[PDB]
Symmetry: C3
Subunit: 215 residues, 3 copies
């Protein structure tokens, strides 16, 4: 019948980043991309040993991180800075016949068995649907762009209006063999009003960790 | 004396990217850069075996792709989205004495011998002209920027105004040795309204393929 | 006490890039990032031989380069294009206890022993001060950002308002081993009105050379 999404109102005055947030909202406002050559040698072997698809498995890791730190779940409600209780993955699906992509969001759960079941359900449903947003918008989401075409050494998302655009964006490239290691390009872009080099740094470090500890 | 340029009006209704174009024209408007580490080992060996300069031969390969796929030949005319019959390369020539660059375009031809003849004629002519555009602006053109200074793992063009800026931009790096292979960084900035990940993707793949053939 | 900042007003009429500047200020205005996988093998072994920290040593090399070429020392003063006689580094300091970063600046000197003494004086002073700009703003400065958390293959900075923003920005990453070499990710962003490919090009080529020599 109905569902409500939860948030937390943050008073800037009590926040240790009050002066930074005020600056990257006005004078110093900027977004930044960064690309890493992620090692997924262990993440590939374990995914392939199991009856699993790479894409939703990696999605889950990302969402897990995104639901681990409040600096990623920030948005502007009614002119007020808030933190979502949870943030759901918006991922891209490619339609081979028409050469277009579509974006659909799955509901997030910590449990991987549960998340894949919701994912498969959404992809078995809207997977062949030609609409740009088969399910539509949801206030509390982050984005994952699949780029299986290019093993990129760089990726930069360059938006025209970045005002209040706090939702982080992942782009993942074509993985490849290098020595005894299998690496996958990963790009992350964020707003500086909500994310410092440190915030994105520890997440990307934990991103390596999780890709070396099962699904 | 007089010539008229290619013009194909796209009616947005009959297009499979109707709402895609609509979104990236307003709400989600953005450009995106990707750098790749291009293999040119076979390309350099065949260019060096013949009497060709590296620069014009590569320009041709890019323009061969640019004129193979309509998504790269898109532009806004009189408030309408059109596709140019053909698009011509605009390259940068460096003036070492004054430490500045100029931009001049050459007329595209599918025959390489003929295009290099045009290129030779154009560079022999205006190569020492200190005007920013010694030949002027032209509607149907894409960009190539030379950067033999730096072997970059990243390059990002970052336009202040991206309204209707559908013309794609290449930047090529200082090539270098790595084992047996010769890598040259290449980077494309493209408007998202006209190009999706897939579009840039197949062209980079075809860019690789074409480099592994002859000139 | 009192201090007058030196500059030189550039008349555009005589300048060889008058056409480019006018273009990259209106119609084709853009900034551009680029990341280089820097070879610091010789630079590390030299800094580690002495009792110097890596950060100030590198800060100095970048500043020595900005203050070498006028195209990095450009800005809009009172609606006019001026070149500062010198440009100072604004570097970042991370506070671990509160997980926020500050930005201070040290008056640049061509002599490394001198500079470091001022840098030390500033960090020993405001290194534990939790204000965003513990020293404040300065007309003539370039930016250096430490990113020791990620060994990035690409860093890209996208500013909202690039109007007249000619001050160059550096982002330096987590250095790592690659065979015999020790390489370190480095990004620069510049306004195309003040910087062409060649300017960034030679500075990064010189940056490699200055790293293969001594600390200063
Ligand atoms: O447009 C999408 N993805 C593209 C794929 O190239 C890219 O990741 C992107 C994401 C967000 C965006 N935005 O918010 O303006 C623009 C492009 C969907 Cl995820 Cl909405
Ligand atoms: O501006 C030029 N070249 C620069 C050099 O790096 C770059 O390729 C570029 C191309 C197009 C552009 N634009 O139209 O906004 C801006 C920079 C000339 Cl090709 Cl016009
Ligand atoms: O905010 C700062 N640094 C960040 C660190 O992520 C970055 O170097 C940056 C530099 C300049 C800038 N600007 O003025 O637009 C914004 C961010 C200070 Cl150095 Cl001003």
């Amino acid at each position: 019948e109905k569902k409500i999404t939860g948030y937390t109102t943050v008073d800037i005055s009590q926040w240790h980043r009050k002066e930074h947030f005020e600056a990257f909202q006005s004078v110093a406002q900027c977004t930044y991309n960064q690309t890493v050559q992620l090692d997924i040698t262990a993440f590939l072997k374990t995914v392939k040993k199991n009856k699993h698809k790479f894409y939703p498995a990696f999605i889950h890791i990302l969402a897990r991180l995104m639901n681990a730190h409040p600096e990623f779940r920030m948005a502007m409600k009614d002119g007020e800075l808030v933190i979502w209780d949870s943030v759901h993955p918006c991922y891209t699906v490619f339609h081979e016949q028409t050469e277009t992509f579509s974006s659909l969001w799955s509901e997030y759960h910590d449990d991987f068995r549960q998340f894949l079941h919701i994912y498969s359900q959404d992809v078995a449903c809207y997977g062949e649907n030609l609409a740009y947003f088969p399910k539509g918008f949801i206030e509390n989401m982050f984005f994952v762009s699949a780029n299986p075409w290019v093993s990129f050494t760089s990726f930069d998302l360059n938006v025209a209006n970045m005002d209040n655009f706090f939702a982080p964006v992942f782009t993942m490239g074509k993985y490849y063999t290098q020595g005894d290691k299998v690496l996958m390009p990963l790009a992350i872009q964020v707003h500086h009003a909500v994310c410092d080099g440190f915030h994105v740094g520890r997440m990307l470090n934990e991103l390596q960790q999780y890709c070396d500890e099962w699904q």
